[PDB]
Design a protein around this ligand. Sequence first.
Ligand SMILES: *[C@@H]1O[C@H](CO)[C@@H](O[C@@H]2O[C@H](CO)[C@@H](O[C@@H]3O[C@H](CO[C@H]4O[C@H](CO)[C@@H](O)[C@H](O[C@H]5O[C@H](CO)[C@@H](O)[C@H](O)[C@@H]5O[C@H]5O[C@H](CO)[C@@H](O)[C@H](O)[C@@H]5O)[C@@H]4O)[C@@H](O)[C@H](O[C@H]4O[C@H](CO)[C@@H](O)[C@H](O)[C@@H]4O[C@H]4O[C@H](CO)[C@@H](O)[C@H](O)[C@@H]4O)[C@@H]3O)[C@H](O)[C@H]2NC(C)=O)[C@H](O)[C@H]1NC(C)=O
Ligand code: XSQ
Ligand code: CA
Ligand code: CL
Ligand code: NA
Ligand code: NA
Ligand code: ZN
Length: 806
Amino acid sequence: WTATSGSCKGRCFELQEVGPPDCRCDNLCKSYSSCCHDFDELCLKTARGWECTKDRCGEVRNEENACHCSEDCLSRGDCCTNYQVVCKGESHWVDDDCEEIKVPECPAGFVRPPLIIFSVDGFRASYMKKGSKVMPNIEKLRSCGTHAPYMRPVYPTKTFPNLYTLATGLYPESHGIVGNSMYDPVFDASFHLRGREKFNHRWWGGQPLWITATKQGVRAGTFFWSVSIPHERRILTILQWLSLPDNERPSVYAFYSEQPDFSGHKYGPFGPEMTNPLREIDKTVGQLMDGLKQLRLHRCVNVIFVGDHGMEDVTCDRTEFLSNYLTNVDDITLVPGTLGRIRAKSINNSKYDPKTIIAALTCKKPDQHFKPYMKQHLPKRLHYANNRRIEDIHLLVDRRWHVARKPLDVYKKCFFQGDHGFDNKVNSMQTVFVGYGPTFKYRTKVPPFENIELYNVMCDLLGLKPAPNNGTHGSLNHLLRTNTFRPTMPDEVSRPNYPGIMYLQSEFDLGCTCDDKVENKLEELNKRLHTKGSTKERHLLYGRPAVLYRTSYDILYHTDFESGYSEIFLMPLWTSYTISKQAEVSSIPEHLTNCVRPDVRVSPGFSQNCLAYKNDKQMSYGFLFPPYLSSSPEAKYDAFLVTNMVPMYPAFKRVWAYFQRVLVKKYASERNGVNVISGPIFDYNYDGLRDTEDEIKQYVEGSSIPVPTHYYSIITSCLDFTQPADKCDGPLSVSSFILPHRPDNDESCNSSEDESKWVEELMKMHTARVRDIEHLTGLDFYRKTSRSYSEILTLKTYLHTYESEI
Ligand SMILES: *[C@@H]1O[C@H](CO)[C@@H](O[C@@H]2O[C@H](CO)[C@@H](O[C@@H]3O[C@H](CO[C@H]4O[C@H](CO)[C@@H](O)[C@H](O[C@H]5O[C@H](CO)[C@@H](O)[C@H](O)[C@@H]5O[C@H]5O[C@H](CO)[C@@H](O)[C@H](O)[C@@H]5O)[C@@H]4O)[C@@H](O)[C@H](O[C@H]4O[C@H](CO)[C@@H](O)[C@H](O)[C@@H]4O[C@H]4O[C@H](CO)[C@@H](O)[C@H](O)[C@@H]4O)[C@@H]3O)[C@H](O)[C@H]2NC(C)=O)[C@H](O)[C@H]1NC(C)=O
Ligand SMILES: Cn1c(-c2cc(OCC3CC3)c3ccccc3c2)n[nH]c1=O
Ligand SMILES: [Ca+2]
Ligand SMILES: [Cl-]
Ligand code: NA
Ligand code: NA
Ligand SMILES: [Zn+2]
């Protein structure tokens, strides 16, 4: 109950929300159906419109008016935003030349430049160029400030997950808003766009920027706006707050527009009807900037213009129906649309089986427009598994498509022409970022980056210490004139051992064989130097990775590769090697086909054994340094060491062999040499983080050889490809992947064809950031470069998307 008989007199858009049944006058009261009776009359005034006119100039103040044109309005802070233009002969902000803002130019009593976050729903990245002619205020912000060509949203590319990621710096799996619609099995409660449950605080995890600010003594304007409050009123309210006395005035503000998303759904991302919504948004921006200019705040405030996701062409006729695949369609619940999530309709159904559901949904029609996954098998770059609100079964839907349970759901619930939610690397889902103000750089373009990085920057802009989050703090330092955050590299926790020759061949009883006993002081000194690390500068270009947890491991040197060998996991944590543009591919000689050689530096007790693989009828093995790329017939023996071996399903070896035999050489040719670091990943609990030894769920039969869930590789070269990878003077270029180690290739519908028709496509889907691999391995890469650490942090967050131009 709310006894709405109290009053909003002097309380309009109050920052501190009052507790029921005391009626509310805050910018959310409408949403809670709890405003005081006089809210509309006092707080949502509209009389005379939103603009001053020549005859209103100098007028006597009339408190019924929506905004004012009287002499006292500036000090009162409630002039219409075009007041000085109409009445005092000023120019609109957009018509002024831009001038570098070297320092904040703020009124006396401002303790820090305010931050205003201007967020636009469904503002696709390509609107910046394609709509440039009709958005002159936004074009000025973009060209005069700091801008990215696009900003990557999080998956799923829906509104709530992305706005809450913006506020927290967290992946949806960690902040808990994993979709626009959710069932939480622990609460046994559902979250929906319509309705009351979404206001319960138990949905919302992490620590959003407004709480971070408050806890550290920085005042915040309210971020959420009830949909009915007109945009002009939201802007005038912000301007009024900025006119409060020093002790009451917030330092951070948010504006939110439901456009262009709302029209985008109805007309498609580029429907002709889209011009007007873009014009109207640009007009709102201009009202904000004109209003700031009137208050002498237009060179004081930092403004962020940011979208939550883009918009794609999607119509009713592009719907796949689960009823075309499943006979049991009524025993499941589908969360539908541009992604799918499936659970059992009833938990009392003992016959429900996710394995047979997956199989009935796998590669059944030739151009099937969705792909089923257990959530732990989704591309790791999506970070979309570690939450009980994410159903075990997931459908990744092709761009431009919908999935639905039955045809009746679509025609009984064509309206729409646009939608979003798809894979966050899809071009049409990309969104925008512009930063403008004294703290941002002037006329600067920065590379694309992910929205999880913004929370840290907004903290930096406000002098706040960020809560723990998924951004990499420092990786956006190149956006900023000052207030950069200067992190130190993490300290290595475990130092390596450097074992020499310590074991005789006959001490090994591993069931391994190699035809290698075929026999010189010239080249015997030479081989010992290679084993002492004489070629390590060639194969370890950026220093060895640092181990950031407590463990026991060895550095092993070789002619062609260097490795950090885990005595706990019985295999390398990492293997590093460089392949020049000139390098040659050879084959495995016949006599060495099943050769596995004991490593006399490493005890039998800390070694894998061949008998375990013989006995394990499902498990085979591969090598981290590829024998195919050995530098000489004599160096090739090193690649057959038991310490270079790793467990691989036969199905996975098809993938791995094509990457090692074909793709590495191809990249070396295209990039002028590549350095490669490859290794295993164990993430059995799908939390995105390195598993400890006791979390491993599968071993090679009869052994303590743990089976990786994934294999990574990090492929680095010179950004200036006219310099060879091993002789690079400047910035680096990287691409990486985290391939799932799976016993079949069901994921790849064309896998019965030659690897050249399907392996690269799989690899592209499982592209990764170095930083993703770091979380998954507890390693820290690029420790020894000639580059600034912030620049290296940016490199570590780079994702190679394989999408055509934006
Ligand atoms: C992205 O960035 C984020 C933020 O840094 C990273 O997420 C963190 O991961 C940490 C490491 O796993 C994790 O630390 C754990 O915290 C537990 C206490 O957590 C509570 O308090 C914090 C602080 O206020 C709060 O943030 C948490 O909020 C989570 O949970 C609530 C649900 O109530 C949600 O509303 C909220 O959205 C968030 O959920 C997410 O995280 C949880 C995990 O905490 C997931 O389960 C959810 O799915 C969702 O993803 C909590 O309110 C603490 O109990 C843990 O300690 C256990 O393990 C350590 C290991 O060192 C051990 O020392 C302890 O003994 C303890 O073990 C005992 O309990 C076990 C389980 O009950 C039991 O098995 C044992 O036998 C022991 O008895 C642990 O320290 C941290 O909470 C989250 N933080 C957030 C905000 O998510 C994330 O990793 C990053 N991602 C990547 C890829 O890098
Ligand atoms: C969705 N929605 C919101 C709205 C605005 C938000 O932030 C605005 C700015 C910080 C990015 C939000 C931030 C986080 C979570 C939900 C949000 C909802 N207000 N009105 C409305 O319909
Ligand atoms: Ca893990
Ligand atoms: Cl959803
Ligand atoms: Na086997
Ligand atoms: Na297949
Ligand atoms: Zn939408």
